[PDB]
mmCIF file of C-alpha atoms in Angstrom:
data_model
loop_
_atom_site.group_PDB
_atom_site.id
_atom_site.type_symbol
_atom_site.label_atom_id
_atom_site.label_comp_id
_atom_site.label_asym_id
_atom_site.label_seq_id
_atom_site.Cartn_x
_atom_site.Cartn_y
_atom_site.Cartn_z
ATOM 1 C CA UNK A 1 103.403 100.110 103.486
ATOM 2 C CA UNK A 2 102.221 100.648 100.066
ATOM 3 C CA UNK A 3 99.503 98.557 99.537
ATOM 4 C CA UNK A 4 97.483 99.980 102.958
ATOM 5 C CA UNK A 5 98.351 103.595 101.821
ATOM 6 C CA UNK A 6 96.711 102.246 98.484
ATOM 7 C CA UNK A 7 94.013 100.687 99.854
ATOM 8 C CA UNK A 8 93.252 103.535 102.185
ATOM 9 C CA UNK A 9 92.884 106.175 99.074
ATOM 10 C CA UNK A 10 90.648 103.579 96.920
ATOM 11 C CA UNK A 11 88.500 103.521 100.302
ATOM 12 C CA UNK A 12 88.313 107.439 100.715
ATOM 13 C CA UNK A 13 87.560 107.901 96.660
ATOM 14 C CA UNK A 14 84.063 106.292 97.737
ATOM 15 C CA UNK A 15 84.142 107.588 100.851
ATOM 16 C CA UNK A 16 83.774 111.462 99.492
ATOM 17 C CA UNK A 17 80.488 110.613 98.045
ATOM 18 C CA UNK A 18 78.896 110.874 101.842
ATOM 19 C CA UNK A 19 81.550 113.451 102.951
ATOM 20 C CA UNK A 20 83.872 110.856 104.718
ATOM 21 C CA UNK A 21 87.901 110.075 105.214
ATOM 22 C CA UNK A 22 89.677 107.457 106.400
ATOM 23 C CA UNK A 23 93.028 108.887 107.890
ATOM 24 C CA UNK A 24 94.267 105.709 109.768
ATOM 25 C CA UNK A 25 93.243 102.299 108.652
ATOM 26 C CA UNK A 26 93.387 100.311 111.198
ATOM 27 C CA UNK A 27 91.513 102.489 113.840
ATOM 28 C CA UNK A 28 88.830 104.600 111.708
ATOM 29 C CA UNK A 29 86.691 101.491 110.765
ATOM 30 C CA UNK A 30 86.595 100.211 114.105
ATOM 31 C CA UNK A 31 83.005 101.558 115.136
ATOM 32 C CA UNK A 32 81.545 100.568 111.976
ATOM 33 C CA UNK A 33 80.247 103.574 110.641
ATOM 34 C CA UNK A 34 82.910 103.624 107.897
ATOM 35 C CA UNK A 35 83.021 100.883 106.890
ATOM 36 C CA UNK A 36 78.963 100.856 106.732
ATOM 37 C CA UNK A 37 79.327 103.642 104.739
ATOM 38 C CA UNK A 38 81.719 102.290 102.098
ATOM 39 C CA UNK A 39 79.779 99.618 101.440
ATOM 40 C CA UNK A 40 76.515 101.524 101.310
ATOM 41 C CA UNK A 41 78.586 103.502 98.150
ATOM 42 C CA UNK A 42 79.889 100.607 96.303
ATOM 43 C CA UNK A 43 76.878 98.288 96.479
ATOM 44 C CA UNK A 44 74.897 101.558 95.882
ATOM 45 C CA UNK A 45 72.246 99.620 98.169
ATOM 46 C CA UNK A 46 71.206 100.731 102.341
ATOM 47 C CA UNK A 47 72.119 98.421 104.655
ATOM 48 C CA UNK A 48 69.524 95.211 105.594
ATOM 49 C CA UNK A 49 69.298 95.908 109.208
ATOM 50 C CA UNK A 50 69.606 99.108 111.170
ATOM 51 C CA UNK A 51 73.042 99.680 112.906
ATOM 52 C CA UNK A 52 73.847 101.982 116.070
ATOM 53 C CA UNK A 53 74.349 105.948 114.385
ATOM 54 C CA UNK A 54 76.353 106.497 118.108
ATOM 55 C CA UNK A 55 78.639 103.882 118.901
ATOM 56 C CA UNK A 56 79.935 104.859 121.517
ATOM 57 C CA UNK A 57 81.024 101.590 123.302
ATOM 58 C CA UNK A 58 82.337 98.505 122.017
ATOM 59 C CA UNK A 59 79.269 96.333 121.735
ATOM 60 C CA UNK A 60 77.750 98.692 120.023
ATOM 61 C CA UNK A 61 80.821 98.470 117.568
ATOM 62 C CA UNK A 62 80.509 94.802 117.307
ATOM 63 C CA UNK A 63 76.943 95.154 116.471
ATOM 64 C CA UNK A 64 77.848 97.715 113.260
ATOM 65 C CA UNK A 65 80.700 95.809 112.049
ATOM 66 C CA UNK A 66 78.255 92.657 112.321
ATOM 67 C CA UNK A 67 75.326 94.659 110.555
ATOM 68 C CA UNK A 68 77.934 95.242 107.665
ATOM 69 C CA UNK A 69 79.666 91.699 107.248
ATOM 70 C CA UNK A 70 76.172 90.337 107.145
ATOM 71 C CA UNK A 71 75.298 92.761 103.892
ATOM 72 C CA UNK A 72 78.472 91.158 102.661
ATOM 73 C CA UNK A 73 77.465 88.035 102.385
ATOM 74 C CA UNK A 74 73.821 89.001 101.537
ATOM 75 C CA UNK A 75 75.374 89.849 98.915
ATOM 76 C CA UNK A 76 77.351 86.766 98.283
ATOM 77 C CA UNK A 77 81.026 88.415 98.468
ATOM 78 C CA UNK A 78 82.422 85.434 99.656
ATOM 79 C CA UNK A 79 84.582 86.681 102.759
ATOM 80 C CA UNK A 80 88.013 85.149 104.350
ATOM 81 C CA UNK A 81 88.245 84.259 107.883
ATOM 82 C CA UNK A 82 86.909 87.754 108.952
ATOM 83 C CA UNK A 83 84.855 88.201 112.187
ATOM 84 C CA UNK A 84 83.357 91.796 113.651
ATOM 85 C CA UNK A 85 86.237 91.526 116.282
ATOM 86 C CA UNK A 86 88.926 91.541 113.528
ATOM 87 C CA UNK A 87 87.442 95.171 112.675
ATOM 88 C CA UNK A 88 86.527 96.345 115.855
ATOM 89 C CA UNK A 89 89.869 95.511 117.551
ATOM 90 C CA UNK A 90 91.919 97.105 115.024
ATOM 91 C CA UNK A 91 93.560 94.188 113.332
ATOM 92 C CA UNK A 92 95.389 95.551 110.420
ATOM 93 C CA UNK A 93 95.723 92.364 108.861
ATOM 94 C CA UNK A 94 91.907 91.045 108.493
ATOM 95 C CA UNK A 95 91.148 94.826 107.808
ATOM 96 C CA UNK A 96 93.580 94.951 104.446
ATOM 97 C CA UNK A 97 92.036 91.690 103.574
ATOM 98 C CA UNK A 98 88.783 93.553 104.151
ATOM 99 C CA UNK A 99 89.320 96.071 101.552
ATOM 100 C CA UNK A 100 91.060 93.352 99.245
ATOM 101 C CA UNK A 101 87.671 90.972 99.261
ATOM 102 C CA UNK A 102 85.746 94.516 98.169
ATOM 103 C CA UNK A 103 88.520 95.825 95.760
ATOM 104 C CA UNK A 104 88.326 92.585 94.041
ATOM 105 C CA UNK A 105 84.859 92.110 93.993
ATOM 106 C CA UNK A 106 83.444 95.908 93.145
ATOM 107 C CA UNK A 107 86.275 97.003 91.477
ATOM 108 C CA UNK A 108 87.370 94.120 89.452
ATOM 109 C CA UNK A 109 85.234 90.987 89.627
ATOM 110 C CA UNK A 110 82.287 93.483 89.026
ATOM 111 C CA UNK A 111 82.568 95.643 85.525
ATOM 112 C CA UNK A 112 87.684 83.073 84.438
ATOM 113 C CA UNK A 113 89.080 84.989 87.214
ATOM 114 C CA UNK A 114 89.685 88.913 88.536
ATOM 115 C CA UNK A 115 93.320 88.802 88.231
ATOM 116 C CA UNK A 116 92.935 86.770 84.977
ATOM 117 C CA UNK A 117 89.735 88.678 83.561
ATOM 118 C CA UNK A 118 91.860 92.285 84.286
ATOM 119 C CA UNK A 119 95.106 90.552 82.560
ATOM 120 C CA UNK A 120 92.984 89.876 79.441
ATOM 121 C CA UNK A 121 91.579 93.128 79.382
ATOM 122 C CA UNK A 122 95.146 94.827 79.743
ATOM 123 C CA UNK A 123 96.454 92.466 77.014
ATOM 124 C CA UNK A 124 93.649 93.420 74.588
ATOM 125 C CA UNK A 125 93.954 97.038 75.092
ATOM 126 C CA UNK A 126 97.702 96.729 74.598
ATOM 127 C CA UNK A 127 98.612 93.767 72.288
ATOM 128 C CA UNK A 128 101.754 95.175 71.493
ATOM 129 C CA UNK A 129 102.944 94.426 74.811
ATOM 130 C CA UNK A 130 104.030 91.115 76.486
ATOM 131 C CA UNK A 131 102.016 91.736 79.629
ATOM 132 C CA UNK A 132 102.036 88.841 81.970
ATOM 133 C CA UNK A 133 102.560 90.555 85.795
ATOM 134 C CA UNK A 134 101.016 93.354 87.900
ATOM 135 C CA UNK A 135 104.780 94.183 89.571
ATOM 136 C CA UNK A 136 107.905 94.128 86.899
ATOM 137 C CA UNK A 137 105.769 94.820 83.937
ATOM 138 C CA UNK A 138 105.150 98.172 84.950
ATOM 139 C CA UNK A 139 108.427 99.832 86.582
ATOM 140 C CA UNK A 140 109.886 101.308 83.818
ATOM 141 C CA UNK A 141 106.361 103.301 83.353
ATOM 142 C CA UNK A 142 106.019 103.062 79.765
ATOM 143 C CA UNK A 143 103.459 100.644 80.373
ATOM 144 C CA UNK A 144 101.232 103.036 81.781
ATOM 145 C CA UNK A 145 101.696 105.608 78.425
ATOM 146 C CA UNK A 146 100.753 102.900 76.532
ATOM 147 C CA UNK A 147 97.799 102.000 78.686
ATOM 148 C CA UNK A 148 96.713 105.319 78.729
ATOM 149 C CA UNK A 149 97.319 106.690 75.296
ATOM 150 C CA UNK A 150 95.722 103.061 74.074
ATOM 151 C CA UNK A 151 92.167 104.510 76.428
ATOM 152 C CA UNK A 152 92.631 108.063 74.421
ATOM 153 C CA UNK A 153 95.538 108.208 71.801
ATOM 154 C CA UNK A 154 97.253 110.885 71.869
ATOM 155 C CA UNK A 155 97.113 111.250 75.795
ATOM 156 C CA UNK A 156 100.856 110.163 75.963
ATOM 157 C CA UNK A 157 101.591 109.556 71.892
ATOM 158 C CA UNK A 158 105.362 109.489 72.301
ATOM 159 C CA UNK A 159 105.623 106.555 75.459
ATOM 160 C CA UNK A 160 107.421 104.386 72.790
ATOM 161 C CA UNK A 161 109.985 106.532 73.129
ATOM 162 C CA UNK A 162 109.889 107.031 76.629
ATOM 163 C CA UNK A 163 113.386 106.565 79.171
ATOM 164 C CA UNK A 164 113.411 103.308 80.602
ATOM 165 C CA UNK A 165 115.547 104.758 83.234
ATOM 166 C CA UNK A 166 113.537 107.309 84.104
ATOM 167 C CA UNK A 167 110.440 105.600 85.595
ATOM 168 C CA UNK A 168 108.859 107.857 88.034
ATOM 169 C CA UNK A 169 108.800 110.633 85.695
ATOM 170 C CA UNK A 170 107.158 108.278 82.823
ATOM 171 C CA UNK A 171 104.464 106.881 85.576
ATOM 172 C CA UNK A 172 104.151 110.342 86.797
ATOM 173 C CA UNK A 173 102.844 111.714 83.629
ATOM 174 C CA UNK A 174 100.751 108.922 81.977
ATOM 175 C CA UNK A 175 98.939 108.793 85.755
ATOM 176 C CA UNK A 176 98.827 112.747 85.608
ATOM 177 C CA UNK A 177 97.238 112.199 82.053
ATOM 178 C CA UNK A 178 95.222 109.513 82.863
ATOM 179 C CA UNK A 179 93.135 111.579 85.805
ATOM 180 C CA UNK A 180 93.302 114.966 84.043
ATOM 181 C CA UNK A 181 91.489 113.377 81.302
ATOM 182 C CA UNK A 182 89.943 110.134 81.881
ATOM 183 C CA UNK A 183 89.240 110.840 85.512
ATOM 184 C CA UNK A 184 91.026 107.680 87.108
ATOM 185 C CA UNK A 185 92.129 108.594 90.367
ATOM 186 C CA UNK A 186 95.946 107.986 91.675
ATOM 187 C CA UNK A 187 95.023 105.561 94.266
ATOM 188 C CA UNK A 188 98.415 104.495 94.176
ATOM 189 C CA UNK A 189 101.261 107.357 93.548
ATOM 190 C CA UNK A 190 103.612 107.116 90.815
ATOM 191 C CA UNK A 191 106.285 106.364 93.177
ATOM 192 C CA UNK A 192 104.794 103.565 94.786
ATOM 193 C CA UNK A 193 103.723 101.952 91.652
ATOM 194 C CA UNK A 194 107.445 101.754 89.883
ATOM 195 C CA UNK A 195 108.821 100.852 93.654
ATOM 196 C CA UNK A 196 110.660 97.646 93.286
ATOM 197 C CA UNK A 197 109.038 96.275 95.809
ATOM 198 C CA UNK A 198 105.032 97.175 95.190
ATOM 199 C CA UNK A 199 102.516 94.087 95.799
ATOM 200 C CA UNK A 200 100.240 93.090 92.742
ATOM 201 C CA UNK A 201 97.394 93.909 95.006
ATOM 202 C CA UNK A 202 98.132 97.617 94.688
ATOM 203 C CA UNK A 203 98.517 97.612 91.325
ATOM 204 C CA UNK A 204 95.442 96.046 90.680
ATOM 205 C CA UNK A 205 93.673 98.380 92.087
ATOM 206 C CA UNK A 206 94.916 101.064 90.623
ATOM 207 C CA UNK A 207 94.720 99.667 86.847
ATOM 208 C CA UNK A 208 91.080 98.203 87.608
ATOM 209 C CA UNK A 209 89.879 101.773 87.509
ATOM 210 C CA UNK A 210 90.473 101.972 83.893
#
């Protein structure tokens, strides 16, 4: 569950720049005009074709989600077995991977590979720090003060000396910190993030935002 509630609030951070919200993932980018949208925001570019403003049927559907995956690989974001049916017949799978391909390429592979390139840039900013995973690494929360005291010391000084034990509260308030003052959204909540259970993926995009 956590990584579509993740991606879900990535997509509606760029999704308030044209007064838009994804509530439901696998239904609200069916028609294309989301998802059109989204990628109008991150590539900062309009779309290469015009697309149906009304669609109200499903070809019309086929022919937005078309008009978009066609920008995407105008673009060269390589994409993964993804057709406009995936999208337009709400296939919750193909749609997360969606997401993933533009997390990973905006977000990440953007600013070797991603998940290396981000690794070395956590591992510089905290050398300190045996950092080698996007999961374990990162459950006791002290991580994240060191992360974000390391962007802006003094932001979470004393996460050193932070209770291993106590993990949401030490995630809670470096992330608190960390968009009070640095303006990085919680994409993924401090709950979800020092879950036992959270998928790399969601971390990633969380931490690329730094």
């Amino acid at each position: 569950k956590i990584q579509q509630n993740t991606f879900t609030r990535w997509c509606n951070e760029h999704l308030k720049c044209v007064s838009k919200r994804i509530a439901n993932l696998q239904t609200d980018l069916s028609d294309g005009l989301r998802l059109i949208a989204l990628l109008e925001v991150l590539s900062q570019k309009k779309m290469h074709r015009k697309h149906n403003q009304r669609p109200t049927f499903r070809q019309m559907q086929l022919e937005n989600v078309s008009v978009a995956l066609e920008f995407l690989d105008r673009e060269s974001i390589k994409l993964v077995s993804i057709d406009s049916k995936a999208i337009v017949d709400g296939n919750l799978k193909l749609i997360l991977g969606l997401i993933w391909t533009l997390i990973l390429h905006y977000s990440i592979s953007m600013p070797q590979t991603p998940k290396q390139r981000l690794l070395g840039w956590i591992q510089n900013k905290l050398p300190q720090l045996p950092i080698t995973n996007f999961s374990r690494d990162w459950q006791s929360g002290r991580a994240l003060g060191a992360l974000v005291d390391s962007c802006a010391p003094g932001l979470c000084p004393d996460w050193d000396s932070w209770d291993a034990s106590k993990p949401v509260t030490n995630a809670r308030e470096a992330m608190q910190q960390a968009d009070d003052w640095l303006g990085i959204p919680q994409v993924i909540t401090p709950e979800e993030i020092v879950d036992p259970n959270v998928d790399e993926h969601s971390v990633m995009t969380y931490l690329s935002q730094f």
